[PDB]
């Protein structure tokens, strides 16, 4: 019976592939062919944030567009005032091995996680004047690779156990569990309306999940290696995935298959972080070659290089107003770019 | 000075945060980082117990005015290549090998020899691109069990090309040589082999002086005298 069922699964896969091929009349490179090129995009480092001693793994900006949070392997979670490079807070982490960090949209909480399989939420606005561990979320059997805040009470976390989780912070339990990935999930990205989110895993596929229903709406498979980063388009109708095969890919939810591929012959290193500009025209991708490129989303042409780091660029963020772009790398320094 | 009173106080707070971070980093930099690795039932638990006597589990201990951190990653059911780069820069790697596994067939469940799987893991981590300079500290655990196993169970089960006799010394030396031959970074790193047991008490001393040798080597590389 298993053979018949897998043959039916293959027939369904072939039907999906035929449907995708049928609804592909023109390529993205043909519609976005006569449009004006973006031109050479040059950004200088405006601020350099020093104070981290070990290698940085994640950062998140926040809605206020001024503060930001950075996580490093030294065991410290540092909140920076990017305007003046001041350190607003320095939280000593219980577990030094952290690979992700999130800053709440309201700004009252900050999240972190890593090899300890626990997502720690810290209350920034404490009456005592310090920063306390508001909540510890456990239940994942793999390392936390990404985590983002729906609001002050709900959080979405991706771990290496091939599953994602939706937690209610107040009760500390998993309200929802998203399964279906056959590989470790390395990143997630929430839609602007917080109704859907995409998760990229090590199975070379990115899956779209509905937060409320809890089911997998769609899956996209165009990559040839592990997917390390993912980011929604500003309008929420598309997303971009970076992978270890030195290629980025722009997929569309409504089209249901891949739109664009971003690759160059002299780039052979994987992508550790991708991000979109405010308008979505520029796709900034951090590579393993110590650099960070700025691709043109519509034209797929390279627009500029952010080469100011002496080690792997591990994390990338763009302010909600798009004013500046922050790059955090393994050389223990963050850099703001304009 | 264009800053205001609140701005000046914020800058003072930032400077105090910097001074605390520097002190914490100086405290951390005087501490030894050991990455504990091994197969299932290899003997990591008894090594942790010996360290205590004298997600991720961390063990902290002290010997001869040196503080040792030992990260027993253990039950991390995930791809090793997605988080193994976090552990580069550790002072040493402590790999545990169970000798009595030389004739134990089940691996995870693949039904291919456990010693071969341990050798494959050792080859994978020793030749890993991140640990190109980190020195392995190989522990051949369960020597008491092996000393009785080899008497009645020949080593040819694991190594068909073994032409030596079935004695403790020859078979143990052969296993050590086979493990050391998997090292391809002969010049950059050294492998420190120690034959431990269930009830021996010299393990922490071996870790101490192996780390001392690694520190001397690193100091010579910093000076360039090596």
């Amino acid at each position: 019976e298993l053979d018949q069922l897998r043959q039916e699964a293959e027939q369904l896969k072939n039907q999906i592939r035929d449907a995708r091929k049928a609804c592909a009349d023109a390529t993205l490179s043909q519609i976005t062919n006569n449009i004006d090129p973006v031109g050479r995009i040059q950004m200088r480092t405006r601020r350099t944030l020093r104070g981290h001693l070990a290698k940085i793994y994640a950062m998140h900006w926040g809605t206020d567009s001024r503060l930001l949070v950075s996580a490093s392997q030294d065991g410290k979670l540092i909140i920076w005032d990017s305007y003046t490079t001041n350190k607003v807070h320095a939280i000593p982490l219980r577990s030094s091995w952290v690979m992700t960090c999130a800053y709440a949209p309201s700004g009252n909480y900050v999240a972190c996680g890593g090899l300890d399989n626990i997502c720690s939420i810290y209350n920034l606005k404490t009456r005592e004047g310090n920063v306390r561990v508001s909540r510890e979320l456990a239940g994942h059997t793999g390392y936390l690779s990404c985590c983002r805040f729906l609001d002050d009470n709900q959080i979405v976390t991706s771990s290496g156990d091939t599953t994602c989780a939706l937690w209610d912070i107040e009760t500390g339990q998993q309200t929802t569990t998203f399964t279906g990935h056959t590989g470790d999930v390395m990143s997630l990205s929430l839609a602007p309306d917080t109704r859907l989110f995409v998760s990229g895993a090590c199975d070379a596929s990115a899956k779209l999940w509905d937060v409320r229903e809890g089911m997998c709406r769609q899956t996209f498979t165009g990559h040839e290696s592990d997917i390390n980063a993912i980011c929604f388009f500003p309008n929420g109708n598309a997303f971009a995935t970076g992978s270890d095969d030195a290629t980025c890919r722009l997929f569309d939810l409504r089209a249901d298959q891949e739109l664009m591929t971003y690759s160059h012959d002299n780039i052979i290193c994987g992508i550790t972080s991708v991000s979109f500009s405010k308008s979505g025209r520029l796709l900034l991708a951090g590579y393993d070659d110590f650099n960070c490129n700025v691709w043109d989303a519509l034209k797929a042409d390279r627009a500029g290089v952010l080469a100011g780091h002496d080690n792997r660029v591990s994390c990338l963020g763009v302010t909600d107003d798009g004013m500046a772009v922050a790059t955090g790398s393994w050389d223990s320094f963050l850099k703001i770019w304009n | 000075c264009t800053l205001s009173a609140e701005d000046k106080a914020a800058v003072e707070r930032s400077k105090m945060i910097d001074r605390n971070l520097r002190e914490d980093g100086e405290k951390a930099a005087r501490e030894v980082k050991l990455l504990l690795l091994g197969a299932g039932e290899s003997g990591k638990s008894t090594i942790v117990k010996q360290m205590k006597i004298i997600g991720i589990v961390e063990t902290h201990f002290t010997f001869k005015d040196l503080h040792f951190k030992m990260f027993d990653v253990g039950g991390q059911r995930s791809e090793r290549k997605k988080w193994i780069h976090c552990f580069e820069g550790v002072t040493a790697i402590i790999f545990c090998v169970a000798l009595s596994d030389y004739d134990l067939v089940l691996a995870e469940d693949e039904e291919m020899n456990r010693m071969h799987e341990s050798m494959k893991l050792f080859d994978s981590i020793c030749n890993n691109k991140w640990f190109t300079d980190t020195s392995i500290i190989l522990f051949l655990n369960k020597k008491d069990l092996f000393e009785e196993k080899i008497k009645k169970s020949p080593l040819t089960i694991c190594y068909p090309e073994y032409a030596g006799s079935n004695t403790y010394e020859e078979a143990a030396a052969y296993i050590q040589c086979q493990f050391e031959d998997l090292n391809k970074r002969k010049d950059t790193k050294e492998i420190y082999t120690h034959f431990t047991c269930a009830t021996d008490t010299k393990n922490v001393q071996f870790v101490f002086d192996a780390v001392t040798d690694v520190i001397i080597k690193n100091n010579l590389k910093d000076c360039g005298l090596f």
Partner: single-chain antibody
Amino acid sequence: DVQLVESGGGLVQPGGSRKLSCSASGFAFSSFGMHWVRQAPEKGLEWVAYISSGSGTIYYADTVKGRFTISRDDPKNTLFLQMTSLRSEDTAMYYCVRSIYYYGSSPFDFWGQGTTLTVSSGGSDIVMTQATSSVPVTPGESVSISCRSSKSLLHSNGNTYLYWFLQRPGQSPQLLIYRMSNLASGVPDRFSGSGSGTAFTLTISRLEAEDVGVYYCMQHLEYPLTFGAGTKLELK
């Protein structure tokens, strides 16, 4: 919760010496800068002394410069004010106030109860002026408390350093609005701050019975802190 208790007040002859102790509880004392503030029996508040976190910087008022010494004992969580050569003008009630400074912080968040000192018998600073001494107000209405400054309180960084405090009868002052716009934690949304430059106003909507008291206007731009004359609020 969070509390500060003042001790060491008593009858003093002129030219004597005295020491005031603020004992803190319920918060990270070492991370908070500390202020000593004076309130004479009939007139308004006036800032006396300040010591930062870790004793990095210390500031005094010209009235108490030289005679007074403010210090902090972080491990025992105590704030000391050693005052010498006491004149008769220092008889007042003293408050120890906590204030933390970072982006988005709320300094002067909490005030101590105060201790009583009874001593038995200028220029180049911002003059904060509250012209109206008091207004008769019927509860349930909307009242506006005005304020003025000799020098503009708006800095080049976009922050207007104006604070609003309410001192109920028999109670320590309570912070209502910090930086002229932001509402303090636990403060009802009735209070609203506005204004620009040198003129500011505080608006209260749907006044209720616990709003009666004296409202004080304080500036934090130039560090010789000056409070307003105060505006008493009384029922009809």
